[PDB]
Enzyme design. Structure first.
Site, PDB file in Angstrom:
ATOM      1  N   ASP B 345       0.864  -1.162   0.000  1.00  0.00           N
ATOM      2  CA  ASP B 345       0.000   0.000   0.000  1.00  0.00           C
ATOM      3  C   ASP B 345       0.914   1.229   0.000  1.00  0.00           C
ATOM      4  O   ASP B 345       2.098   1.124   0.354  1.00  0.00           O
ATOM      5  CB  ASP B 345      -0.881  -0.049   1.253  1.00  0.00           C
ATOM      6  CG  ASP B 345      -1.732   1.195   1.433  1.00  0.00           C
ATOM      7  OD1 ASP B 345      -1.666   1.785   2.539  1.00  0.00           O
ATOM      8  OD2 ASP B 345      -2.469   1.593   0.497  1.00  0.00           O
ATOM      9  N   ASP B 686      -2.152  -0.523   5.920  1.00  0.00           N
ATOM     10  CA  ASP B 686      -2.609   0.139   7.145  1.00  0.00           C
ATOM     11  C   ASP B 686      -4.107   0.424   7.143  1.00  0.00           C
ATOM     12  O   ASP B 686      -4.658   0.877   8.143  1.00  0.00           O
ATOM     13  CB  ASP B 686      -1.852   1.457   7.335  1.00  0.00           C
ATOM     14  CG  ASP B 686      -2.282   2.516   6.343  1.00  0.00           C
ATOM     15  OD1 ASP B 686      -2.386   3.691   6.724  1.00  0.00           O
ATOM     16  OD2 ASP B 686      -2.538   2.181   5.172  1.00  0.00           O
ATOM     17  N   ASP B 690      -6.941  -2.891   2.829  1.00  0.00           N
ATOM     18  CA  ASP B 690      -5.809  -3.813   2.699  1.00  0.00           C
ATOM     19  C   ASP B 690      -6.147  -5.169   3.315  1.00  0.00           C
ATOM     20  O   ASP B 690      -5.385  -6.125   3.177  1.00  0.00           O
ATOM     21  CB  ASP B 690      -4.551  -3.232   3.364  1.00  0.00           C
ATOM     22  CG  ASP B 690      -4.040  -1.977   2.667  1.00  0.00           C
ATOM     23  OD1 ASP B 690      -4.196  -1.877   1.433  1.00  0.00           O
ATOM     24  OD2 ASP B 690      -3.486  -1.081   3.349  1.00  0.00           O
TER      25      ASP B 690
HETATM   26 MG   LIG Z   1      -2.920   3.073   3.481  1.00  0.00          MG
END
Ligand SMILES: [Mg+2]
Ligand SMILES: *[C@@H]1O[C@H](CO)[C@@H](O[C@@H]2O[C@H](CO)[C@@H](O)[C@H](O)[C@H]2NC(C)=O)[C@H](O)[C@H]1NC(C)=O
Ligand SMILES: CC(C)CCC[C@@H](C)[C@H]1CC[C@H]2[C@@H]3CC=C4C[C@@H](O)CC[C@]4(C)[C@H]3CC[C@]12C
Ligand SMILES: *[C@@H]1O[C@H](CO)[C@@H](O)[C@H](O)[C@H]1NC(C)=O
Ligand SMILES: [K+]
Ligand SMILES: [Tl+]
Ligand SMILES: [Tl+]
Lengths: 268, 992, 39
Positions: B345, B686, B690
């Site tokens: 990410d 995070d 995700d």
């Molecule tokens: Mg992120």
């Protein structure tokens, strides 16, 4: 193939052949040096045989010899081992002044034939007649068990002195020259009868010390025949034969450390 | 099952408000009926998420109790009770042997079960985190009246109302809104507020303004909407199910464990039954044939090995806990070392997740600011009088403020009330000009025009802090081009000057460059109003232009971006040097995604996309050979119409990949694509978007401070300080533990041979038993334990970060080379050293080696209390047994003595001990404690009963010393050959 | 000696055990010292 090619299969064989060959050659080398540090006449350690064991001829199934008097093949098993032992104490086996000697027909003192050396031939052993074993095919009724003290090189079995009290209190106490053997069971439902050298219920000290198989082959250890002409029948009788001495001790674990454990039963 | 959920969603934002009501039998104004709502409740079911069915811990524990070694140990434990049963019936055996050994072995299985159970842990509460995002209550309009209801009682069709501060209770079709902004970070990973209005604004429902989603929250304003989806049927409720439903799967390390279990189990059953028949042929009673088999089992199975592995893993996880890297699953300690591809990410992972000033354009010059958290860069300018003029506008023409009580925390980390751009500017000036509040106190704001959608600028009028003036200063900021159309002069190095086409062109150049860097650019200008035309009491009208907004003085430009975390660029390069492929997978827009890719080193300098080639050469993209482009940037909207085979080609054909504007399922798809090619993949993230990717990853790593609760539930590892450098450490630790496990496994296995061989020679030679079954367990469960563990503390023999990731198909934890060395070479030398001491003990007590062959018959005969030794002496039963058990004790101690050398040689696979040294203090500890344990077990009174361990004479300890030394020399010579010729012979044969 | 060679069939297993246990303990202490050089 499985793993590799033929060329690789060969190389892995040539390696392990030389490798294991070397290892075998090294192992053997260390065995050589071990043997080189040892005597031919006497073992390095003797503390593990120290207190002599007492073993008998009747091959006990489990410290027991039960059979039927009214049956032939009921005791023919115990007569096999009994014969095996006594067959060794033949007179034809003890011929000439070599390597046997006529010793006192009465319990005598020790005999030192020098040291544990080869500086002399075969150390001459005392003769022993199976004919000293009175009364004992064997006892088809009321067995005639034969006792034996385990051989230990350089061991001098020392009898107890009549200073204080004794089990068989002072009776026929040949204090100086006899290692006594008194069998027991309370529970006194038997009839103990002992046979041996000089008519004594012990081991004549003139058969000691033992010089070992290498320095004394054909050597004969003293026997003590014991007969139980018990007037009882059809019951397990726990009979314990005990030897007494200064160098004799016992253990709760080793039930053969200077004593017997016989479970006779004339179930007839 | 979940293949449906891996697809992009379909919606009804295209319908009119009225049309949408027909579909759901609803009223736009009155809302649903109390009766109709309750009807729909029973129909569709609750607005809730149901957690997936889990496997109870019962079945999880017992599943370990039947994995190769445990199976063999079970066969042994029962076979003990078998022989015991056969005894209790036949001849009354007052002993406890088979009974107790059967109890001991069954305990070994249970305890070993706990270790593997502890290792195979799965702490997963994905669906629980998602459930936390549904509010307890919602506001609905029913029978023309608004009431709060249990949010679970919400159904498709009713009229819902939301306002700033509340969570979207369900997927809504916006029908009415007033200044409504929403935080869609759940779906994008981006927290910038998105406007919501009734008007349809994009074919894509995840981008349109007239849809609001469950799992997000309203940030400001008010909105009303019609519920289109409820519970599991919402967009993120499906993501929830997808994420929670995904099959976990076996880790690389787990697969390795099972693999050597098969090997060792194989040789165990082989030799087991190979000698079971070999005994019956020799005329051994089944009574004995089973007793030998039990011994064979115990000899072949390394009883303490699986627990060693677990402890070595645990200890490695403890070290990483001490670098702010939390491991939730013990196996994930190794996966990072086997990782060949990282899918990362961007926002809050690679980046700080905070709009930060990156560059400034003043004095016809581009200046760069420091974007790093801890400010690890340098200054750009302080001297220029122009800077102070620009700095003043950035502070004054700004409505952002620091939250109360932050004075303790660093400037860049403190919470700010305001939009991202104003916060960035605030923190910029506060950093390099001190307290901004001071500047706003020295220059009192009298009138302002806040940033307007139409004006595209924000202006402010302040009382000049200067005493000699104390007059009125005008400042404004806005779109760079709009600010330009309002300027006549430029503050160059202090003094103003006319805005000639020259500087105007340099402005465009500066503007295009900063924008090309993916940075948001703002214009800044001011104007000192004429004193005579503006008295100290002159009133300014903000509603109607009461003051000039043209012919102003352009001061400068400022650019900003959500920047990389300081450690990220360097960590990315380090991953790439270790041969790990790094891919970006983000919900963010392509221009931003691509710019950070270059910033952190995902896309290296000079590498081009097909679009780059086309623009440079000024040719159509179809005219470009796509193989000429090693880099690519894929938008999610294009990804959607590509098959997996085509996704596989993208993955194969590019070294530098950026997946931008991806949905959560799309991240999962990219991860699966990478895995499909046979790669071990890590995911770093995070956000809740995700979660599926993190779950599917061989190892998911979540950020600890910036991470959402969901992401950290989906992960195997948490970076508690958001230190991306930890990934580099993790992969390094992962590789080190992999090598050290080999060392520890070889060490443990090596001692199997000296435990097997005595039992074999017992049969083939008919000699007294050299070593007992109990004695074996004193080794594998006792002495070898701490030494085997200590190998986990071994330093690397070379630069492990310099090698490529292991090939999980070829590079195994236990291979033929390990067995050859442990079983064929070193263990064989240990066996002899054991036997030697055995022959020494017996020969020194009177039983010379020659007379031992074929004596076991009379030796074991309990009724022969007069066995003749070599010297003609007679032994009772218990007497010779004491010597025999003393043989077991010295054979045992011989193993310990030969394991000394083995421990030292297993220290290194390649290097010499003279190179690696002896700096492992745990290992040395192992040596001392191992020897202490052995001595205690031999000399402690009473151990001769409980373990049949007998006191050894001093000379006994030294029997195996020459064998211990040969091991050290042999292995040192062998490894000397390895190093001296990287060719292959010694290497390809023995190099673990 | 001659008939008084009782020492030939004797071993001080008691002292050996005392010494063996002393050694085991001291090796245990030494190990702790080296391990605790940093914990
Ligand atoms: Mg992120
Ligand atoms: C040791 O003495 C025993 C005494 O019983 C011998 O047994 C003799 O066996 C033969 C042939 O089987 C019989 O004819 C005799 O009746 C047995 N007794 C005697 C006194 O001769 C046995 O053969 C002898 N063993 C050896 C090796 O000489
Ligand atoms: C007690 C004694 C008699 C048993 C001796 C067993 C010997 C023959 C065994 C023990 C370990 C074995 C080796 C272990 C490892 C390998 C590597 C593998 O790629 C091919 C087989 C090979 C080379 C084995 C061949 C046979 C081997 C050398
Ligand atoms: C033993 O045998 C002798 C003959 O040799 C006999 O006189 C005696 O009665 C026997 N003794 C016993 C107790 O039976
Ligand atoms: K995972
Ligand atoms: Tl084992
Ligand atoms: Tl082992």
């Amino acid at each position: 193939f499985l793993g590799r090619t033929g060329s690789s299969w060969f190389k892995i064989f040539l390696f392990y052949l030389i490798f294991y060959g070397c290892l075998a050659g090294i192992f053997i080398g260390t065995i050589q040096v071990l043997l080189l540090t040892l005597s031919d006449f006497e073992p390095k350690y003797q503390d593990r045989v120290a207190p002599p064991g007492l073993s008998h001829a009747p091959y006990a199934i489990k410290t027991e010899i039960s059979f039927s008097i009214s049956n032939p093949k009921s005791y023919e098993s115990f007569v096999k081992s009994m014969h095996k032992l006594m067959d060794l104490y033949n007179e034809s086996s003890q011929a000439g002044n070599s390597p046997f000697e006529d010793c006192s027909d009465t319990p005598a003192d020790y005999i030192k034939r020098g040291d544990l050396d080869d500086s002399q031939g075969q150390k001459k052993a005392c003769r022993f007649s199976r004919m000293w074993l009175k009364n004992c095919g064997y006892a088809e009724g009321k067995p005639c068990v034969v006792a034996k003290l385990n051989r230990i090189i350089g061991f001098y079995p020392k009898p107890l002195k009549n200073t204080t009290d004794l089990p068989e209190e002072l009776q026929a106490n040949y204090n100086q020259y006899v290692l006594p053997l008194r069998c027991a069971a309370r529970e006194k439902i038997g009839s103990i009868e002992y046979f041996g050298l000089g008519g004594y219920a012990g081991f004549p000290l003139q058969y000691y010390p033992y010089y070992g198989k290498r320095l004394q082959k054909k050597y004969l250890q003293p026997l003590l025949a014991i007969q139980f002409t018990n007037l009882t029948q059809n019951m397990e009788l726990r009979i314990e034969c005990k030897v007494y001495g200064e160098n004799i001790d016992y253990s709760e674990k080793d039930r053969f450390r200077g004593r017997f454990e016989v479970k006779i039963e004339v179930k007839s | 099952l979940d293949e449906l959920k891996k697809e992009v969603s379909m919606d009804d934002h295209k319908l009119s408000l009225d049309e949408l009501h027909n579909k759901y039998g609803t009223d736009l104004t009155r809302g649903l009926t109390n009766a109709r709502a309750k009807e729909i409740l029973a129909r569709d079911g609750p607005n809730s998420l149901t957690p997936p069915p889990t496997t109870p811990e019962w079945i999880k524990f017992c599943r370990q109790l039947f994995g190769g070694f445990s199976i063999l140990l079970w066969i042994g434990a029962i076979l003990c009770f078998l022989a015991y049963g056969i005894q209790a019936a036949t001849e009354d055996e007052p002993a406890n042997d088979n009974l107790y050994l059967g109890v001991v072995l069954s305990t070994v299985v249970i305890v070993t079960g706990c270790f593997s159970y502890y290792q195979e842990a799965k702490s997963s509460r994905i669906m629980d985190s998602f459930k936390n995002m549904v509010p307890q209550q919602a506001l609905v309009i029913r029978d023309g009246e608004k009431s709060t209801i249990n949010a679970e009682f919400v159904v498709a069709g009713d009229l819902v109302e939301v306002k700033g501060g509340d969570r979207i209770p369900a997927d809504l079709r916006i029908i009415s809104a007033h200044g409504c902004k929403v935080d869609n970070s759940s779906l994008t990973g981006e927290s910038e507020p998105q406007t919501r209005s009734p008007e349809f604004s994009s074919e894509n429902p995840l981008e349109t303004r007239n849809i609001a989603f469950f799992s997000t929250n309203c940030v400001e304003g008010t909105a009303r909407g019609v519920v289109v989806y409820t519970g599991d049927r919402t967009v993120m409720g499906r993501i929830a199910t997808l994420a929670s439903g995904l099959e976990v799967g076996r880790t690389p390390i787990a697969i390795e464990i099972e693999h050597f279990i098969h090997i060792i189990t194989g040789v165990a059953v082989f030799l087991g039954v190979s000698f079971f028949i070999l005994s019956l042929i020799l005329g051994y009673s089944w009574l004995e044939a089973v007793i030998f088999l039990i011994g064979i089992i115990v000899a072949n199975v390394p009883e303490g090995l699986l627990a060693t592995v677990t402890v070595c893993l645990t200890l490695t996880a403890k070290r990483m806990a001490r670098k702010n890297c939390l491991v939730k699953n013990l196996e994930a300690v190794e996966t990072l070392g086997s990782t060949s591809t990282i899918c990362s990410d961007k926002t809050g992972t690679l980046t700080q997740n905070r709009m930060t000033v990156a560059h400034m354009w003043f004095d016809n010059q581009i200046h760069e600011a420091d974007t790093t958290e801890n400010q690890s860069g340098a200054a750009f300018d302080k001297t220029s009088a122009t800077w102070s003029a620009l700095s003043r506008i950035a502070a004054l023409c700004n409505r952002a403020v620091f939250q109360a009580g932050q004075d303790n925390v660093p400037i860049l980390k403190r919470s700010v009330a305001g939009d991202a751009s104003e916060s960035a500017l605030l923190k910029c000036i506060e950093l390099c000009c001190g307290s901004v509040q001071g500047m706003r106190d020295r220059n009192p704001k009298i009138v302002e025009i806040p940033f307007n959608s139409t004006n595209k600028y924000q202006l402010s009028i302040h009382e000049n802090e200067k005493s000699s003036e104390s007059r009125y200063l005008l400042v404004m900021k806005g779109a760079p081009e709009r600010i330009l159309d309002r300027c006549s002069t430029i503050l160059l190095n202090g003094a103003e000057e006319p805005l000639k086409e020259d500087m105007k062109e340099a402005f465009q150049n500066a503007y295009l460059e900063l924008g090309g860097l993916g940075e948001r650019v703002l214009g800044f200008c001011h104007f000192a109003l004429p004193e005579d035309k503006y008295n100290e009491g002159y009133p300014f009208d903000a509603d109607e232009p009461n003051f000039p907004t043209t012919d102003l003085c352009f001061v400068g430009l400022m650019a900003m971006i959500d920047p990389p975390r300081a450690a990220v660029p360097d960590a990315v390069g380090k991953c790439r040097s270790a041969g790990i492929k790094v891919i970006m997978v983000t919900g963010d827009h392509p221009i931003t995604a691509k710019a950070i890719a270059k910033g952190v080193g995902i896309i290296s300098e000079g590498n081009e996309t097909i679009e780059d080639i086309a623009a440079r050469l000024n040719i159509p993209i179809g005219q470009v050979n796509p193989r000429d482009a090693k880099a690519c940037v894929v938008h999610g909207s294009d990804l959607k119409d590509l098959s997996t085979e085509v996704l596989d080609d993208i993955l194969h054909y590019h070294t530098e990949i950026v997946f931008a504007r991806t949905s959560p399922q799309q991240k999962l798809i990219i991860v699966e694509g990478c895995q499909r090619q046979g790669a071990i993949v890590a995911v770093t993230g995070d956000g809740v978007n995700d979660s599926p990717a993190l779950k599917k990853a061989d190892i998911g790593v979540a950020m600890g401070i910036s991470g959402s609760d969901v992401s950290k539930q989906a992960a195997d590892m948490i970076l508690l300080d958001d230190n991306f450098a930890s990934i580099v450490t993790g992969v390094e630790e992962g590789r080190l533990i992999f090598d050290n496990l080999k060392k520890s496994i070889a060490y443990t296995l090596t001692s199997n041979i000296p435990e097997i061989t005595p039992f074999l020679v017992f049969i083939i030679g008919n000699v007294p038993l050299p070593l007992g079954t109990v004695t074996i367990l004193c080794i594998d469960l006792g002495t070898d334990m701490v030494p085997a563990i200590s190998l986990a503390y071994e330093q690397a023999e070379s630069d492990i970060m310099k090698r490529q990731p292991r090939n999980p198909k070829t590079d195994k934890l236990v291979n033929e080379r390990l067995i050859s060395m442990a079983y064929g070479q070193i263990g064989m030398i240990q066996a002899l050293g054991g036997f030697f001491s055995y022959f020494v003990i017996l020969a020194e007590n009177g039983f010379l080696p020659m007379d031992l062959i074929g004596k076991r018959v009379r030796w074991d005969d309990r009724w022969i209390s007069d066995v003749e030794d070599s010297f003609g002496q007679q032994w009772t039963y218990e007497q010779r047994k004491i010597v025999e058990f003393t043989c077991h004790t010295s054979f045992f101690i011989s193993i310990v003595v030969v394991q000394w050398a083995d421990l030292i040689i297993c220290k290194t696979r390649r290097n010499s001990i003279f190179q690696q040294g002896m700096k492992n203090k745990i290992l040395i500890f192992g040596l001392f404690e191992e020897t202490a344990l052995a001595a205690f077990l031999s000399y402690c009174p009473g151990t001769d009963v409980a373990l049949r361990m007998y006191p050894l004479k001093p000379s006994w300890w030294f029997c195996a010393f020459p064998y211990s030394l040969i091991i050290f020399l042999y292995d040192e010579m062998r490894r000397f050959i390895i190093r001296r010729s990287p060719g292959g012979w010694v290497e390809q044969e023995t190099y673990y | 000696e001659g008939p008084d060679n009782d020492e030939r069939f004797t071993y001080d297993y008691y002292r050996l055990r005392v010494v063996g246990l002393i050694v085991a303990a001291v090796l245990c202490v030494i190990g702790i010292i080296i391990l605790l050089a940093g914990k």
